[PDB]
């Protein structure tokens, strides 16, 4: 199935919004994930007050620390977010044409790029994950003014 | 009127791509200009070969540079880009609200994107900039393979 690795790539997203959270930034993270082996192309978090960068969500960082890959490389891999991509993180996935999108949790945030990705093409799964809920319900609580200052 | 600044825009954008030629890189530049008074909230260009960079973009390295801004302060600027944006850039106009886009040339590239800014309801306007179509011609001459390698 298409689905053998999401519960390897959720959890290594998983490690890395904790990753984050840990280092001061919002809890989201990523990593893509070879569709044929499971491998870990790359990993990554929201770098947003870590290098005060207005770019770098978790989907963007994890895309940057997998480097520059060969086109047909991305055609076969899965991109994992603890949290449902914005407009800019949906047009990533879209312009490198990776196939799948598995989302943690979208009940924290949500944009029209969930629909988008459908519209253009790709899988879009959103697993429900309690952990990346509970640590983002957490983040959004005790920091409303960086999360609304932000995406929030 | 809206374009006011709109030839100084694309000259700083212009500028920007004409230095990332000079190191080696792709010549796509911008900037992004408050439409109040035509003040230069920050320019870059592409970084793919400066920097190994999978993510900056023109549009995207543009955005990083300014540093984090107040949400409102990007509700009355326009992006200049010497390149029609792909679907991540797209989305990253999109992401920050920013309601007027100006591209230099949509002839040696072109995505979705550009309608969709319009799908979303932001204004594109499209100068036709001969300068920015004869650096980008030259290096979709000279590099073909590093061209057609990325989103060519
Ligand atoms: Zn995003
Ligand atoms: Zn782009």
Same mark, same amino acid.
């Given at each position: 199935?298409?689905?053998?690795?999401?519960?390897?790539?959720?959890?290594?997203?998983?490690?890395?919004?904790?990753?984050?959270?840990?280092?001061? $930034?919002? &809890?989201?993270?990523?990593?893509?994930? #070879?569709?044929?082996?499971? !491998?870990?192309?790359?990993?990554?978090?929201?770098? /947003?007050?870590?290098?005060?960068?207005?770019?770098?969500?978790?989907?963007?960082?994890?895309?940057?620390?997998?480097?520059?890959?060969?086109?047909?490389?991305?055609?076969?891999?899965?991109?994992?977010?603890?949290?449902?991509?914005?407009?800019?993180?949906?047009?990533?996935?879209?312009?490198? $044409?990776? &196939?799948?999108?598995?989302?943690?949790? #979208?009940?924290?945030?949500? !944009?029209?790029?969930?629909?988008?990705?459908?519209? /253009?093409?790709?899988?879009?799964?959103?697993?429900?994950?309690?952990?990346?809920?509970?640590?983002?319900?957490?983040?959004?609580?005790?920091?409303?003014?960086?999360?609304?200052?932000?995406?929030?």
């Amino acid at each position: 199935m298409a689905s053998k690795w999401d519960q390897k790539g959720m959890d290594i997203a998983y490690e890395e919004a904790a990753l984050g959270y840990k280092e001061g $930034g919002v &809890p989201i993270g990523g990593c893509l994930i #070879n569709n044929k082996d499971g !491998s870990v192309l790359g990993r990554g978090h929201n770098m /947003r007050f870590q290098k005060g960068s207005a770019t770098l969500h978790g989907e963007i960082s994890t895309l940057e620390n997998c480097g520059r890959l060969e086109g047909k490389v991305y055609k076969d891999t899965t991109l994992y977010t603890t949290l449902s991509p914005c407009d800019m993180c949906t047009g990533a996935i879209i312009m490198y $044409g990776i &196939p799948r999108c598995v989302v943690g949790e #979208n009940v924290n945030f949500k !944009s029209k790029g969930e629909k988008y990705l459908q519209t /253009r093409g790709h899988e879009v799964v959103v697993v429900d994950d309690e952990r990346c809920k509970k640590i983002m319900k957490q983040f959004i609580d005790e920091r409303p003014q960086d999360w609304f200052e932000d995406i929030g």
